[PDB]
Amino acid sequence: KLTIGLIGNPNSGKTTLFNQLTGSRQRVGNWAGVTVERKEGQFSTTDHQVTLVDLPGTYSLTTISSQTSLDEQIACHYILSGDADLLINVVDASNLERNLYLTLQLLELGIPCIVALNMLDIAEKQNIRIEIDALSARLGCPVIPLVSARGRGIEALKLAIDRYKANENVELVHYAQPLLNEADSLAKVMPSDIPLKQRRWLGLQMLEGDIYSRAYAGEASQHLDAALARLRNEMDDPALHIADARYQCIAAICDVVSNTLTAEPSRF
């Protein structure tokens, strides 16, 4: 038996993939404490009986700008609740750079994950070519091309689920040493139920100015002002650096991964 969480952007073809996997074997209700719909369904692999949980559409698990989205909170809450044994991240190939911000957050949290590259046919109309193994090597998790024809992308996805394992601990984003040391101090006073790696993540998001992470912080929210001011002795703007270090990482990956599909040559 298994429980998998389906996660991705609003326009990533996530809902369509859910229906194709589960089919008629579905159940409907709502998330705890709200009227927002919660779909669940089941399908079988060679070994496992999978229980697919459809999460709401989301671009990011965090937010700044004082803008709240209940769909994002519900998504982030389920991820941190550790209910699912595995996650399937639906990624749009025609908007890779934008979609990878969510993908990165799932990998930083240490959640076992399988990326499903969707809308490859639309990417080819944009003159875009995706390097699959180059992407997989940098993310440290398997990347399955979700081929529509004959539902053979679903078969490859089921094959990946039976082989699933802990993600390869690669170097994703390269933050500054003071930010990591300060985020670790916030992790000490955070509640001990949450894993160490996830506590360090939460504390890093608090420094950038996240509002969702403060719900799981506890007494660490009181130490934030002292910790944030302490970082400004070394760095000019901590919040700016975290955004740049994150952008730099994704920009580096997209340079290698996203290539031009076809072009008429002008030289020999």
Author numbering: 3 to 270
Authors' text:
Structural studies have also illustrated a large conformational change in the G5 loop of the intracellular Ras-type GTPase domain (NFeoB) of the prokaryotic iron transporter FeoB, when comparing crystal structures of apo and nucleotide bound states. The G5 motif is generally comprised of six amino acids with a relatively poor sequence conservation, although the motif invariably forms a loop with electrostatic or hydrophobic interactions with the guanine nucleotide base. We have used the EcNFeoB (Escherichia coli FeoB) protein as a model system because of its clearly resolved conformational change in the G5 loop as revealed by crystal structure analyses. We systematically mutated the residues in the loop to alanine and characterized their biochemical properties in order to determine their individual roles in nucleotide affinity, GTP hydrolysis and GDP release.
Our studies reveal that the intrinsic GDP release rate is highly influenced by the sequence composition of the loop, with the third residue (T151) in particular having an important role in nucleotide affinity. Given their drastic biochemical deviations, we also validated the integrity of the S150A and T151A mutants by determining their crystal structures, which illustrated that the mutations did not have any adverse effects on the overall fold of the protein or on the G5 loop. All other mutants were determined to have slower hydrolysis rates than the wild-type protein, with the T151A mutant being approximately four times slower than the wild-type protein (kcat=0.12 min−1). The most drastic biochemical changes were observed for the T151A mutant protein. Interestingly, the release rate of the T151A mutant was too rapid (>1,000 s−1) to be reliably determined using stopped-flow fluorescence techniques. A threonine residue is also found at this position in many Gα proteins where it coordinates the nucleotide base in an identical way. These stabilizing interactions are abolished in the T151A mutant, resulting in a ~4-fold decreased GDP affinity (Kd=33 μM) and a GDP release rate too rapid to be reliably measured using stopped flow methods (>1000 s−1). Indeed, the stopped-flow fluorescence data indicate that mGDP is spontaneously released even before the competing nucleotide is added to the reaction. The data also indicate a weaker affinity for GMPPNP, which is further supported by the reduced hydrolysis rate. These drastic effects were unexpected given the lack of sequence conservation at this position, although it is notable that the residue at this position is, as far as we know, never found as an alanine or glycine residue.
